[PDB]
Amino acid sequence: KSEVAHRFKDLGEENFKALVLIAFAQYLQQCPFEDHVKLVNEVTEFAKTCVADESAENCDKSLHTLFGDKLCTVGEMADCCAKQEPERNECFLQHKDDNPNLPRLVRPEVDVMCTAFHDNEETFLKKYLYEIARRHPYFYAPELLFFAKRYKAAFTECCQAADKAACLLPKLDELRDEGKASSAKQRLKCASLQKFGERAFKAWAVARLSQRFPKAEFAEVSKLVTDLTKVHTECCHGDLLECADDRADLAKYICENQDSISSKLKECCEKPLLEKSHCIAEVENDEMPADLPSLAVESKDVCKNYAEAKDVFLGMFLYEYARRHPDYSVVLLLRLAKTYETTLEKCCAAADPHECYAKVFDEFKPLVEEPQNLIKQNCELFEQLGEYKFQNALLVRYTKKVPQVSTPTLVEVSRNLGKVGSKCCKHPEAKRMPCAEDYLSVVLNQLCVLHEKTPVSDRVTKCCTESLVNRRPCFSALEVDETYVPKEFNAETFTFHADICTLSEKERQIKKQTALVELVKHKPKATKEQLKAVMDDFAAFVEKCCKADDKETCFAEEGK
Ligand SMILES: O=C1CCc2ccc(OCCCCN3CCN(c4cccc(Cl)c4Cl)CC3)cc2N1
Ligand SMILES: [K+]
Secondary structure: OOHHHHHHHHHHHHHHHHHHHHHHHHOOOOHHEEEEEEHHHHHHHHHHHHOOOOOOOOOOOHHHHHHHHOOOOOOOOOOOOOOOOHHHHHHHHOOOOOOOOOOOOOOHHHHHHHHHHHOOOHHHHHHHHHHHHHHHHOOOHHHHHHHHHHHHHHHHHHHOOOOHHHHHHHHHHHHHHHHHHHHHHHHHHHHHHHHEEEEEEEEHHHHHHHHOOOEEEEEHHHHHHHHHHHHHHHHOOOOHHHHHHHHHHHHHHHHHOOHHHHOOOOOOOOOOOOHHHHHHOOOOOOOOOOOOOOOOOOOOOHHHHHHOHHHHEEEEEEHHHHHHHOOOOOHHHHHHHHHHHHHHHHHOOOHHHHHHHEEEEEOOOHHHHHHHHHHHHHHHHHHHHHHHHHHHHHHHHHHHOOOOOOOHHHHHHHHHHHHHHHHHOOOOOOOHHHHHHHHHHHHHHHHHHHHHHHHHHHHHHHHHHHHHHHHHHHHHOOOOOOOOOOOOOOOOOOOOOOHHOOOOOOOHHHHHHHHHHHHHOOOEEEHHHHHHHHHHHHHHHHHOOOOOOOOOOOOOOOOO
């Protein structure tokens, strides 16, 4: 009956403290690491008292009460502790900064990190949880413990290898890419739940789980959708203790009932508890039952059953169409289910419904042939340019559409909107649509949450406040901003020094793409010839005066 005690017994002490540390770093993305650890230790020791006696003092309080009490104890000046608890926790949820403007983590040397991992392993492992949750306020918390376990394993093995750098560095880069991809993929779930509602998320789950569990019964999928929606709703609301506990309660439920869900869950249900829940979320699509019936033109009871249970009918409709088309993207199947729902709203309210919806599956062909041709026409362009050059064509085009968007948002989003060809144009003609359009939904959400932080354009808000399924077609038709009169000029941004040649090639290309965006802001009417000219100009400039011994002398130059 005492909450924190029950959550401490289900998760154990090790996962309990780590989840509390994540919840504090995401709510307070500015407090020092040492301050949060003390509060986490003060919370953990009190939770041990309620485990010893659940009827003790303050044990009958809610987690939001206990969290917000010690969080309201630490440049951060909004008075989020607004009287009661409902106004308090939601204040911490709103002020979660998707772009907290924090200095990026500087990766020390391998032996420096290994010696820190050897001295105090706990403090070392807590900072990795701290900084990531600090910079990713909506990071999947139970998934972050999975990365922390793998972040611990890499240092455990590589710090005793003959070549620690050749061992540790390939593993720190992949976990760096896995976490950012996981955070962005999780940021899409919270935006769908918060900005569009639970019904929008459960439709995504029904579609994605039907492709992944096509042999599972419809009632089986609906139970998995109910639990998964409850899990992420708790995670997105900052209630990370119930999220991971229900995620563990769901991981065991899927494993205790594999015969009714999927056959690919054998290896997933053998891994430890953390890897178990991660493996299920990344398991492959099971095979669909052969010779499956199409639909049945169909029932005279369609409108009779569409009225007796609309969501069950549409949910089963989305279940039946998603389980048969694993090659369709999730956003497409939501368009097909939405189109089928709107047609039944007219036909059943019309005179003759049977003939009214007699060609509803023929008007799906234009909706299906749109992502096909898009991917078929963009992998052609991406192949004939490569990733970097294709990003530059996206940088100039996107900056011309909305020049008011900050250069970091433009550079970051255009760099990620260019990585679509690297990830998905390598899959066959059947795995392109779910790969490309669902990754695009993740990046377009990053742009929407970045623009939500600092809005400057009404057109971007219109596409972000529109249907989540039609975000990509909306942004593509934003046209060129012909009214960008404030095309300011500058020269300090174009002034470069010798510190640039100490960075990596990746970090140097970002700065060139940064000036490419600012150059377009300096003259939005610049042609691609003059744009590519200055792109090769500054590239050859920094190339000639770093292979030469000029230091901070040749960079003190100009051209424009
Ligand atoms: O940061 C900002 C701020 C301003 C802004 C305004 C408009 C805007 O348009 C976005 C719509 C692009 C859709 N493309 C379709 C083509 N595409 C692709 C690339 C390679 C392979 C494959 Cl297969 C594909 Cl589909 C990626 C997605 C973006 C921005 N961005
Ligand atoms: K990156």
